[PDB]
């Protein structure tokens, strides 16, 4: 489809956690979602939150419809469960790597299904738990998912990093290595 | 693997040259099984699983009336709002050149994604030796891109990476002397 811009509400429900998600993306970047637990709209940037609003009940009402529709399709499909599609993983820094200068490492996990995933940052074999963040499970036009994980870090010639990824389509956890080279 | 069933929905608005096209997609696992496309004007079953749903939805006049109105009532409305904010987002690229033989023009933290990055050697544009990544989406409403030039340095050569972007008054350049 020809388009200068694509604006998409994307939502899903499923048996396992996360059991629901309701978000809006503009040109493939997530602009807001509805936190279904807190029943509140969450804007990605302050630029958006100050200008825009969205009634969270609109997200909750749509998720209720999807959950009903999921129950129907489980019956109509004779409980068809899809094959697991394992993720592709890439790790790259946000800024040019300068030893001793603060940076952000990004782990992009792509082309996987279902949207059930465990991700851990490792540094020299050990989990890093501070200075981390992550995206939602983001939609793809082929109905698989992708996701971003972030780690604040100070680059150093020594350190080896891993983005360790767990998914049902994998024979064992996937460790994608990165070093400042 | 554990027992797991997934259902997805999408409501997509395609803005192009003043027009709005609306698709609403119903997906079981990864099988799109029914959809409404405003170019089409009614629901269609995408697979056999969608035949009951398309038939039923297409029999409800109020639903068709609502969906046929979405381009003008929902898509155009939200697009006008995004014209006031999202489409005015401008984050200026940072530019760094470093050697790797390649010279790397690393352009970071910019928005929107459309950008032109060109290499010049002694004032002459160099294209045949340019290996570019794709645009890299960072997921945080910024992009980056690495535009690398295959190079054979010789003393005196002056390389310049020039970046053009809607956020800039004028193109920005970084020079590297061999």
């Amino acid at each position: 489809i020809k388009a200068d811009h694509v604006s998409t509400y994307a939502a899903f429900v499923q048996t396992h956690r996360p059991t629901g998600e309701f978000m809006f993306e503009f040109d493939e970047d997530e602009q807001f979602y509805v936190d279904l637990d807190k029943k509140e709209t969450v804007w990605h940037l302050e630029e958006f939150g100050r200008a825009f609003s969205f009634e969270a009940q609109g997200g909750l009402a749509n998720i209720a419809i999807l959950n009903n529709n999921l129950n129907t399709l489980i019956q109509r499909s004779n409980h068809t469960q899809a094959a697991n599609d394992p993720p592709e993983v890439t790790v790259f820094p946000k800024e040019p790597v300068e030893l001793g200068q603060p940076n952000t490492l990004i782990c992009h996990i792509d082309r996987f299904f279902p949207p059930v995933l465990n991700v851990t940052w490792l540094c020299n074999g050990e989990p890093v738990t501070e200075g981390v963040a992550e995206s939602l499970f983001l939609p793809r036009t082929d109905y698989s998912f992708h996701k971003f994980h972030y780690l604040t870090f100070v680059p150093s010639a020594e350190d080896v990093y891993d983005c360790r990824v767990e998914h049902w389509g994998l024979d064992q956890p996937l460790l994608k290595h990165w070093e400042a080279q | 693997t554990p027992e797991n069933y997934v259902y997805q929905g999408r409501q997509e608005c395609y803005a192009f040259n003043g027009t709005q096209r609306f698709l609403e997609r119903y997906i079981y696992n990864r099988e799109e099984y029914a959809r409404f496309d405003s170019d089409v004007g009614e629901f269609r079953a995408v697979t056999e699983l969608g035949r009951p749903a398309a038939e039923y939805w297409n029999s409800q006049k109020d639903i068709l009336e609502e969906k046929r109105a979405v381009p003008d009532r929902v898509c155009r409305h939200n697009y006008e709002l995004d014209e006031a904010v999202t489409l005015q987002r401008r984050v200026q690229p940072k530019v760094n050149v470093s050697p790797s033989n390649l010279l790397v023009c690393h352009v970071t933290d910019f928005y929107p994604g459309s950008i032109q990055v060109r290499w010049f050697l002694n004032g002459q544009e160099e294209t045949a030796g340019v290996v570019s990544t794709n645009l890299i989406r960072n997921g945080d409403w910024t992009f980056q891109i690495l535009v690398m030039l295959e190079m054979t340095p010789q003393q005196g050569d002056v390389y310049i990476c020039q970046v053009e972007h809607t956020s800039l008054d004028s193109p920005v350049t970084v020079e590297w002397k061999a």
Binding site: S53, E55, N62 | L81, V85
Partner: peptide, 15 residues
């Protein structure tokens, strides 16, 4: 209100 974005309403399956 701020500038309010509009939702679409997903349709209920026939069960």
């Amino acid at each position: 209100k701020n500038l309010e974005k509009y939702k679409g309403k997903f349709v209920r399956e026939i069960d």
